[PDB]
């Protein structure tokens, strides 16, 4: 069903939600993650999401339940397809380059406070060829390390 590489990647994802390491994701933990992404879920939304994934109706998500979800929805992700997907999302106009203005929009969309000086520094540090934007090879070099 699921390989070992992907079960390890999914456990690492799980750990980002299970902040107290108790082996369950609560509506509180899901809500914390969502608000860290700039989203504003209601408690009713959070409950609906937990209910969709929660196989034994105990009102929390254990790792087996989370794994069943990832296997239904993400059974083809690696560190590589995720970087490729992130680049496609960030490159709003689809020209194969991330601009200063595109990175500002991504930051807002993901609830990351910004300044112009921070965005400039980010583009300059990633921009290996000096053309003033970040192409995919540049992105991959910057994103390969966690």
């Amino acid at each position: 069903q699921l390989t070992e590489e992907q079960i390890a990647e999914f456990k690492e994802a799980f750990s980002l939600f299970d902040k107290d390491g108790d082996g369950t994701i609560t509506t509180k933990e899901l809500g914390t993650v969502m608000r860290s992404l700039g989203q504003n879920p209601t408690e009713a939304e959070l409950q609906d999401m937990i209910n969709e994934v929660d196989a034994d109706g105990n009102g929390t998500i254990d790792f087996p339940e989370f794994l069943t979800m990832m296997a239904r929805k993400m059974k083809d992700t690696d560190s590589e397809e995720e970087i490729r997907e992130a680049f496609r999302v960030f490159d709003k106009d689809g020209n194969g380059y991330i601009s200063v203005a595109e990175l500002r929009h991504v930051m807002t969309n993901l609830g990351e406070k910004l300044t112009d000086e921070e965005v400039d520094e980010m583009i300059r540090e990633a921009d290996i060829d000096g053309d003033g934007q970040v192409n995919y090879e540049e992105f991959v070099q910057m994103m390969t390390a966690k």
Partner: peptide, 21 residues
């Protein structure tokens, strides 16, 4: 800062996982 690049990748990954619920 590289940390902020990495944090954005992780936020995008978390958004994709949240969208699976």
């Amino acid at each position: 800062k590289k940390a902020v690049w990495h944090k954005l990748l992780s936020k995008q990954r978390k958004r994709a996982v949240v969208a699976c619920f």
